[PDB]
Symmetry: C2
Subunit: 297 residues, 2 copies
């Protein structure tokens, strides 16, 4: 978890949020409700969604009316703590759960971003001495793009033609050849239809048939530049297949960084990685405290 | 000037237009094999500018059908259809963007919304438009206490008269009565509002509407909801809430020069079926412009 990569990645979001400090020099009990309305609107500008911003600021209001918070600096500290709590109190661990046995199998799903993320995940595993096999289940440039990442990261790759058969072939090969992790690509569209839905579920079934412990992770890749708008496709994908974690890409230069909090809060599924740059190492594991410190240093 | 200043609109939407500029590049990669992939990418570019998921879905879905039907066969043609579909969404369902001042005077416009200061500023810039057209304006400080003082400054800058306080309904009714007696052409009313309505505030706003209609049965002629454009699509929550309290006849979307999320204009018209009547595109007093769907589309996609 590279702190300066996270810090630079959230610089545009942090710039909108910087007005919060200015706003809270103006705090006293008499002028509080107006100031908190303005605070809530600052959060909405950074894509904390209406419900998330409501609950963050509502907790602060109760604490003020109860006498627990009685200064700008104290309110600022409560804001940070409440955001940390929203990111952590309900969700399971941000860590990948690879289990006891090998191979672990990770399915990557979502609506090019997926291909890039797949490559950067492979690079992380390779750096730790882990033996990776990629599976090109997005059936045709997708397969070729994935091949470049394989060669680039020193991973092996299984290619096509039916996605389910590609995935099951890769899982079988990994079990036979003592691979530690299989990284699967899958087909997806912005709007799911019956057929695409049937295909993705069929992929999950083929994977579980080839290896009953699989998939260990289903990771949904979302474009952070769409901000809160990503919730619609996230809800849809989770209806198709049990998503175990999110990967939010392209957060670098987004001003809409509050969407990270909203997606965790609304969907009760952890964000596991954030993409904070174009570099191969710019896919970072998510940590709630580091994220909060990046928005509010 | 009932026509919008085109260069003010153009500069006002520059941040939105810069995200939307990638559309042309994207469409250079368009062909029938990758059509579905390209249109997904297109739809995502719209989402970045806060065309909301439902609005972006229906814009692009029409293009998908026209492609499958053979009507569209090129990047340029798809680009043209994109612009036309946005124009249609902005115009096919809503009533006129014009203010409806009616036959008799005074007309009465109530300004509502969450942000006292945005409302106050909008009120002042509306007044300035009326004054420039020779219209005699009376302001009513119904947001009951700096709100009243801020409005007083705008009354002065614009040469408008003002009625001040302390209950809002009584202030509004006093101003409407005064306008009828003293032959004013338009009364511009401020009202109280918060980000989240409670029972009491809700009741107060409804009480203001009732006091206004009792003082003059043709009033209010307009109920204009002022929304902060920098919150983008997030403004839909407070817009739905206000329209449940009082019959909103038009939106005013402010601070649009500060955001890339200009698609929120389309989303609000699409979702709420109520026209956007003005857009605020700068800090200048003349930077409140009357809305026109064609001009807006040309500002996003020149």
């Amino acid at each position: 978890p590279d702190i300066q990569l996270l810090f630079s990645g959230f610089s545009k979001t942090r710039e909108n949020l910087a007005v919060v400090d200015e706003l809270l020099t103006y705090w006293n009990l008499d002028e509080s409700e107006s100031i908190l309305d303005e605070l809530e609107e600052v959060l909405l500008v950074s894509d904390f969604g209406p419900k998330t911003a409501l609950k963050i600021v509502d907790t602060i209001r109760k604490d003020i009316l109860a006498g627990r918070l009685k200064s700008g600096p104290q309110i600022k500290e409560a804001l940070k703590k409440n955001i940390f709590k929203l990111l952590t109190e309900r969700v399971t661990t941000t860590e990948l759960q690879l289990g006891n046995s090998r191979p672990a199998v990770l399915m990557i799903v979502g609506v090019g971003g997926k291909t890039t993320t797949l490559g950067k995940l492979a690079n992380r595993f390779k750096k730790e001495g882990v033996k990776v096999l990629m599976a090109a289940g997005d059936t045709a440039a997708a397969g070729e793009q994935l091949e470049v990442w394989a060669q680039r990261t020193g991973s092996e790759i299984v290619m096509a033609p039916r996605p389910a058969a590609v995935l099951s072939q890769a899982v079988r090969r990994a079990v036979e050849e003592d691979f530690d992790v299989v990284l699967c690509d899958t087909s997806g569209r912005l709007h799911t239809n019956y057929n695409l839905m049937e295909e993705l579920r069929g992929c999950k079934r083929a994977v579980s048939k080839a290896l009953s412990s699989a998939p260990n992770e289903v990771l949904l890749v979302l474009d952070g530049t769409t901000g809160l708008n990503m919730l619609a496709q996230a809800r849809e994908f989770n209806q198709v297949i049990g998503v175990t974690g999110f990967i939010l890409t392209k957060l670098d230069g987004t001003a809409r960084g509050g969407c990270v909090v909203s997606v965790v809060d609304e969907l009760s599924i952890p964000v596991k990685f954030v993409g904070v740059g174009e570099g191969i190492d710019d896919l970072q594991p998510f940590d709630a405290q580091s994220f909060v410190d990046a928005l509010f240093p």
